[PDB]
Amino acid sequence: MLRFVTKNSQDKSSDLFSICSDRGTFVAHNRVRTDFKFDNLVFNRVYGVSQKFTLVGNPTVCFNEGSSYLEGIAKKYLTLDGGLAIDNVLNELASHAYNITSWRWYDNHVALLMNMLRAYHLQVLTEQGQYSAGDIPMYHDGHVKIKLPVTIDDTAGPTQFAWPSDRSTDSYPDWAQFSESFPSIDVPYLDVRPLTVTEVNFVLMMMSKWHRRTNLAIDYEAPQLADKFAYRHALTVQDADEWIEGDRTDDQFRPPSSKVMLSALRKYVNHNRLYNQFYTAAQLLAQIMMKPVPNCAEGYAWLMHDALVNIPKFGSIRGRYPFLLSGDAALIQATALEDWSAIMAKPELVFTYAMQVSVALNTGLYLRRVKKTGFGTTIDDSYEDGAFLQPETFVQAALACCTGQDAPLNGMSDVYVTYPDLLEFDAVTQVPITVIEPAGYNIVDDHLVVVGVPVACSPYMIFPVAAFDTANPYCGNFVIKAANKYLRKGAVYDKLEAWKLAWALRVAGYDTHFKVTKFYADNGDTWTHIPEFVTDGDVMEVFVTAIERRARHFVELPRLNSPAFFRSVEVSTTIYDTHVQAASRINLDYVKPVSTGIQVINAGELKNYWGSVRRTQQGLGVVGLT
Amino acid sequence: MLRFVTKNSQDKSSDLFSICSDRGTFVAHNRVRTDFKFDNLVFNRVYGVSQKFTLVGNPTVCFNEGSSYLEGIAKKYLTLDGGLAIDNVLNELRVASHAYNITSWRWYDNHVALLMNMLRAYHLQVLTEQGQYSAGDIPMYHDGHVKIKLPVTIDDTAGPTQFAWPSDRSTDSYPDWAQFSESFPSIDVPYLDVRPLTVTEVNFVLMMMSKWHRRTNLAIDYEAPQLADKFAYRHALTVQDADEWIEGDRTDDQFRPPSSKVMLSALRKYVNHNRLYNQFYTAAQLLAQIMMKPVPNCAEGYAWLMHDALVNIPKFGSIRGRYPFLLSGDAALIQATALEDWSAIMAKPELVFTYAMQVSVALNTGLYLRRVKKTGFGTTIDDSYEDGAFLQPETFVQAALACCTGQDAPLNGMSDVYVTYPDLLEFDAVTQVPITVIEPAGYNIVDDHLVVVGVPVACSPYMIFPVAAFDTANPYCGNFVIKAANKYLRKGAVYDKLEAWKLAWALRVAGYDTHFKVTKFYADNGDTWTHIPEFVTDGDVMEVFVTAIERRARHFVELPRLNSPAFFRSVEVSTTIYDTHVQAGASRINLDYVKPVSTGIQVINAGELKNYWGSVRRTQQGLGVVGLT
Amino acid sequence: MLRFVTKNSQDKSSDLFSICSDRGTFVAHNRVRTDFKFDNLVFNRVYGVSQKFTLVGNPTVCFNEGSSYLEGIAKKYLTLDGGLAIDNVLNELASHAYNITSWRWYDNHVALLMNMLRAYHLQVLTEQGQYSAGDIPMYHDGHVKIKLPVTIDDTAGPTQFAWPSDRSTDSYPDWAQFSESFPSIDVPYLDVRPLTVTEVNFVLMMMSKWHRRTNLAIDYEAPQLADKFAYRHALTVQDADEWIEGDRTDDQFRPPSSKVMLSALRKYVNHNRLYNQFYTAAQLLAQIMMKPVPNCAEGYAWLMHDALVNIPKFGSIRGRYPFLLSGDAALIQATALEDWSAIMAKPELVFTYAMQVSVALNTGLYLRRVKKTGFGTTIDDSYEDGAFLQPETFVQAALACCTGQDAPLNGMSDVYVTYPDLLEFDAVTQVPITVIEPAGYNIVDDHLVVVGVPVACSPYMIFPVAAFDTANPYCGNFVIKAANKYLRKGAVYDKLEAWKLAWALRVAGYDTHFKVTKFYADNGDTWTHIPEFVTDGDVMEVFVTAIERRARHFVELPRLNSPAFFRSVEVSTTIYDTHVQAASRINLDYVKPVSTGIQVINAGELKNYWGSVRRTQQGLGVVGLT
């Protein structure tokens, strides 16, 4: 994910942002200058654009077991594939020799790593002093009032990060202390030797069942990862045990700080060599993290829609034997290693990547819906069902169709964040609406309806996004061309050319009408949504009438509508300064990972989904890392 | 299937009609203009010709054992010649044999029955939401003379007006299902992968996995037991809404069957995910071939309508959700015809219904065509017509289609599947028709029962007009000339049988009925088509006498005395279609939307006739099964 | 046997059929079209032919020990030949070192595998709902009534598959549970670890003595395979023990279903790597399975004659040590492996191969008897005693002489299905006959007699059978040629030409007379038996008189008897559709076996009889696989 973020703008920028919330939402502000050069008369207008985001969500999570991955053990303990070298293990150690015939090796700690990630982010948020239940923004446009419900009330919601479980009200895993060389039960054991006492306590107690107490998307409900397990440690750690039996009071046993929690993460991962599984965990957390708050009224359907996540069941063989984590670690992906090094250099790469993936996902789904019609795209590709069926490649396909670069795959099989109710282009949403005054809006029975996925963000977190083959507002610059034909009342225009002209005029300060009435563009973002009527098929020409001016006008432009006054206006848009408000630039040359004691493979296996998906000219598809 | 409808791209386009039917039947209107060119000037008549089709049928189903096919499996485990690589799947299994003995031995992937069930449910729900789903009712034949009325197993008026679930709650058992996400299969049992389906679509799929109760007389509501006794589905979320409805927890109101769009999306998602293009192609072929029959406008024509078809739908088996990595990779040797036909159906679902309408007419006409072309109007001495394609039940419908129309009939693309009529293999097959008591006029009624030999023509060719059924010019060709009689005598105007029928048809269109000897030309008003009389087929005769040509009450374009010299003029007849519309109670398609998905799909145009990937071609020597080339 | 069945017709067909019975007999129907092209006038006649089969038989089985075969152990545990590598075993493990000097290694489980095969087929038959005692058909031809006796009466015979043994009325093997690494007694032990509890129970209890309770040929009597043994399993299984001591009632302890029985078969074979021994077991079961019901009256001598089977005594060393079944399995025949993969893909390959081998065996014996005389064959080969003396190559020699392809050998030494009373050409049979009306029949003292072996089937399960070098009805097509000389009353004809003419005329619908009176051909099969008088020597010419027509006549043909009207009639016969009635096509590309972890040898050793026998021009003989 490091390559994706560092390639959205340029290899030199590498701009990162920290987590911030304000009752569950935050706003990312920008400052952008737009040019207008025509007849060697360069004009410009500098303005600020704001795209706010919300961390409130209610994703659905299913905990279903999957494949077993052993890409962290020594070379001699692995065969030519991911399967362990059982003969080597036994020629090293009996009853176990006969027992092994009945010991499946299901080692997959992705659920644990994701749990630690969300707990760390929650603790960072509460030490930042703004952790709360989280509430959706209340959007009101003079004509329509909307307010999506949330389960947990913010005011009564907790302000401090409590432990996910309860006071012994629910059962807890039967943990144990392990120091021998003989695994006694096929139940998984962990190896937490480098961890300190408090880190081990946090790990074991958070293994227990998690309860959802806030509307935060990373606060989803999760059951206990394993009913029984043991940890291979030098000493027994039992402070959390005193807490469950009802001895340690809340004040002395509180969730550990962010620094120690991140340290426990680091120790766990780089002692068990879980770089691949942690990369998968970070990918899933980034894809589940947050959604943008829509400026337009109909964009709230994106907020109401809930993702579906498939986290594999927890299993471990690392702690079963102590020599497995020794030796030379094998089959570690270079992308996973570099991503791990970067995220432990700065732990907010996940946050900035999550915001970028949210914006890219929304725009990719919407542009798939639009480019189905034939707007901007030459080839009538199978956008509907091509690479969006594969749940693991769903969000990556959306990112590829939006941005055009190689979206990083989950790196793990049978894990995905998927919107099942979004593959169809007929899917509707009933957003609650208390209409203030009647206007142009498809308001039927107190809820307007939307078709497919709407726009809820603006392509400003990722600006140079190459959505279309030709120049467009999504691209850096475009040239407004002559109309197809001019008439008395106006001129006809192609779908894309008309939208480009309307966008440029809205930035300049002109309101643009059309027939077969307004090009919508909300203030505070000044990005013109694609018109609903032109979105559908059978419409190839747009009649532009009445290019009127607005109350506030910035750049004064020719008519471009009358043949006499049309001029080849060439525009150009560049983003200058961004600052979230509820930098931190990274340096690749200082975060390079540890190549020693690690065997690194550049390529991956398509079964395990170690690759990327790129929007080819002939159609987007999955490709190998090679 | 698409190429057959488009007649191999008639101006790169064709036309389709959606399914619509009232009381189990629907008319199929037409408007044509028939010319008459004599004395170097042209007369014409514009008349509306209709055709009645019925969805009612009672085919005999046979869910017997069938072969397995692994076409939608990744390219690295299948192979064109090396076939299934069991070494590769054992390696990628993650000892090996310890998994072999459990489940890795069967390899019985076949979902044809499930796809057919989903398709018929889609059709039934379409009829339901169009306000036209009801119990079937075969029309009656009122003609003043002998009248025919047939019974129905379920009464129409008491018949249900709403498509409820096929199975009946609290009467029969259901397959035992439970979500399964384990990498390692545990029990040898069909595992079907439904991961990307929504809750309602996966619910609909697993509910249609159950057994099917017939609640109507329609031909696509045939009985079907539960496809698998036990099974498990690969899905992230455990779905039990169907299970709740199995018990009393969920009521009938809250588990109504979904809309047609939801079932269509479920079918699209299933076939796209599992790469079931060929299997769905076979399912669509079978369902269309059993869809419907044309209601005759003649008396002896109902004998064809009495017959019931026998279908070989293979027993269900799914090995695609056992291993997640089976579908990871481009599909193996998917037929190009299957891909294009799948894209066409998903774009326009009415293609299956239109192809069914075309196939019913083509088959009913081609059975008559073969019963005649075997003897060649009785001037063929030996048995060197090679009609043996009619023998094996699989190429029955295909051979009938190829014999009726010169186009290559599409093979079923699957082995041990067919739609066949066992008792009509031989052309000397007698059938009895229950008949009401009315005085006769030469309908050879025996014991108050029409005795019918062979198979009768029951439909007009107006939906496939360029049929080219016969070699010579004729009404089937559309344009023909009427020549002078061979020689004139007292009885009058010796005519060859085929030319006599051509003259009779043209005169009946023009408003003159004709009298023959060795007596008239009983035809239909609504459908001014005159079906070929038995003197053409019998082959005992080679010349026929036309005694008098009289004027009907409904006179039309005026002609001279054709059956006499010094008065006959060589009129010529040409007809063109003005407007066709299938009403009851259209959607243009061109070859622009045919473009199939070729991203990550290995496509082979060639096929092997062992698996029935070809097309039967009619030549002058006879029929012949030809591969896909 | 897969190559034989798939080569009888063509590599593409591969047609298989399931087991079905109707009071012990079933009928296989066909639909065949016969052509008659002459003077460019192609005529044809389509008709159905039915050849019924019977599963009732009383074979004689002798349980005599033979060679010890060790072609399933690892490479290091075997020497350059089948003998085990005793030095390698001992340098792996003592008293055993001294004990071994007195441990013969007799490992041969063919009797066990055959017992499981017959039990599985019986359970399939009873779950099909038609299992019974089985009764021979009662054939009656208006002139003669015959009904062969059977020991068990069908009506009182059991309808459900009971366990072969009794209620502790007979003694049972003293089984034991083994888990150590030390074999305590030279008594054999088995290794049944992958088997479940019920599969182990079925295996051990069916090891006990088998009792014949029905007239079925696969229900032959067999004693207990071993008085003592032990099974190497994780746990003791004793439900069948409770059954023998008289505790578990019949209802809870019933014979396992077909699926679990086949699963036990699969587990046993592919864990002990008994592919060769199982191939031998399937061969023997196929050769013993069934016989055809004869349409002609004198053909019932084939029914009365009983085969002789030599099953080796049961012995096992697989369960003695647990490491033997590990490693790389050695010396596995490719034919055996592919046959095993096919039969576990579909378990009815054995049934279809058994029906084919029955038809081929009868026709091969009869054609050996006929071709002794000189009918059709040029060389007076030693058909009487050449390759029919070797009991193991008896049935294979019959198949080779019939069909002409390579009959698959038993793949095991000192095992055979042999008819000792059939090598002579003078062997007679006294079939019981209640004669209805006197006619042409050699009826002496209430029993007609037959000489040698008669025809009891028709070559329709295997049609393209190349019995003779020249064209014939057994071949696809033949041309009726001009007579040697024409006389006033008729024309003379060679033996084979006269029989070809008579067969063609009977298919057409003409009855053919001859002198030095009728060419017999029964309806429902319309295949003309070779005339008895022309069968013997010293007769080279046949006088054909009076080619009269029949009651039902299909194809109208020239006289072919008078020189004026003789025409070069060319016939052609093809089979279109078959359907047994008391398909299932196989696909070779999907049933390919597991080549990994198995060492496969194409060639075999003539001592062990790993080969095939082909009818060469100069004479049939055994050849190697090479």
Residue numbers in the entry:
A (entry chain A), C (entry chain A): 1 to 93, 105 to 527, 535 to 600, 608 to 651
B (entry chain B): 1 to 94, 104 to 527, 535 to 601, 608 to 651
Question: Can I see the authors' text?
Answer:
S. cerevisiae, a genetically well-described system, harbors in its genome an endogenous virus known as L-A virus, a member of the Totivirus family, and its discovery was the main starting point of research on yeast virology. The L-A virus contains a single 4.6 kb double-stranded RNA (dsRNA), encoding for a capsid protein (Gag), and the viral RNA-dependent RNA polymerase fusion protein (Gag/Pol).
To derive solid molecular insights into the L-A virus structure within the cell extract, we acquired an additional cryo-EM dataset at 0.93 Å. A high-quality de novo model was built in the derived 3.21 Å L-A virus cryo-EM map (FSC = 0.143). The backbone was explicitly traceable; the α-helical pitch and β-strand separation were both discernable. Side chain densities were clearly visible, which allows us for the unambiguous placement of most side chains. The icosahedral protein shell has a triangulation number T = 1 organization, consisting of 60 structural units, with each unit comprising two chemically identical capsid proteins, formed by 120 protomers, with overall diameter (400 Å) and thickness (46 Å) comparable to its crystallographic counterpart. A similar opening diameter (18 Å) at the icosahedral fivefold axes was observed that is hypothesized to serve as a gate for the exit of viral mRNA and entry of nucleotide triphosphates. Detailed analysis of the L-A virus identified previously undescribed stabilizing cation-π interactions in the capsid that mediate interactions within and also across L-A protomers. In the asymmetric unit, 26 side chains are involved in forming 11 distinct cation-π interaction networks, formed within monomeric and dimeric interfaces (examples are shown in Fig. 2c). Structural changes compared to the crystal structure are detected in both capsomere subunits, specifically in loop regions (R94–V104; Y528–K536, G601–H607) of protomers A and B, respectively. Specifically, the flexible region spanning residues 528–534 encircles the active site. This loop element undergoes dynamic changes as it was not Cα-traceable in the cryo-EM map; however, in the crystal structure it was resolved, pointing to a regulatory role in the binding site accessibility.
